[PDB]
């Protein structure tokens, strides 16, 4: 009978394909690298993770998005997000099912999770610096679908954050450099040690090249995306 439109989510696959292509072009091995030619400021992301707390020993991973909304991915594989109005909540279970509630009007079974989210929110506000504070996100964030944290992991050197909109963010611990990868735009935003930022179209990095600093981080990114797909 009728089919409808089953979700065949290709975003991670597309990201791998894009990274494989850019890396195979050996972008830092050029007679003259012309990195600026690959800039595309219009591809600036709408959302990224601005703060995070790994309390997975007890509760889960709490995070803030750049629009000031907060979320928690709990240890039971459920998600709770509080919008930037500070009142409205979205609850996402293990199967991806979404429901809506508020801090004052909610199912009793979610009381603990709401209390914990508030603890995460307050902790991040009191203690943590907002990443990309100098970045104005792409216009229309209120009109876009607010993403949640699908997957995350930490390596020795980085945290890898996979958002439901297909974006993958990699924050490097030692030097505070960060990558925001979007497979829809086929773009990467690089935040350097000085907090200066640039957005590049990956296909243009293939054509024009880039510095060793970015090229090496894109090789690492490919490895991380492979891990997400594994």
């Amino acid at each position: 009978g009728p089919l409808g439109s089953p979700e065949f989510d290709c975003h991670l696959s597309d990201m791998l394909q894009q990274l494989h292509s850019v890396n195979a072009s050996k972008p830092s091995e050029r007679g003259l690298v012309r990195q600026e030619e690959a800039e595309d400021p219009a591809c600036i992301p709408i959302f990224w993770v601005s703060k995070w707390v790994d309390y997975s020993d007890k509760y889960g991973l709490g995070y803030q998005l750049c629009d000031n909304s907060v979320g928690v991915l709990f240890n039971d594989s459920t998600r709770l997000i509080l919008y930037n109005d500070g009142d409205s909540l979205q609850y996402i279970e293990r199967d991806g099912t979404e429901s809506y509630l508020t801090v004052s009007s909610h199912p009793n079974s979610l009381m603990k999770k709401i209390t914990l989210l508030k603890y995460f929110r307050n902790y991040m506000s009191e203690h943590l610096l907002k990443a990309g504070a100098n970045i104005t996100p792409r216009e229309g964030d209120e009109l876009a679908r607010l993403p949640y944290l699908r997957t995350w992991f930490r390596t020795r050197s980085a945290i890898i954050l996979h958002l439901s909109n297909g974006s993958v963010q990699i924050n490097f611990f030692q030097d505070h450099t960060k990558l925001i990868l979007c497979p829809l735009m086929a773009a990467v935003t690089y935040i350097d040690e000085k907090r200066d930022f640039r957005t590049y179209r990956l296909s243009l990095l293939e054509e024009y090249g880039c510095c060793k600093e970015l090229a090496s981080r894109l090789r690492y990114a490919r490895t991380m995306v492979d891990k997400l797909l594994s």
Partner: peptide, 6 residues
Amino acid sequence: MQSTPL
């Protein structure tokens, strides 16, 4: 672990 502090 946590992100960068103030």
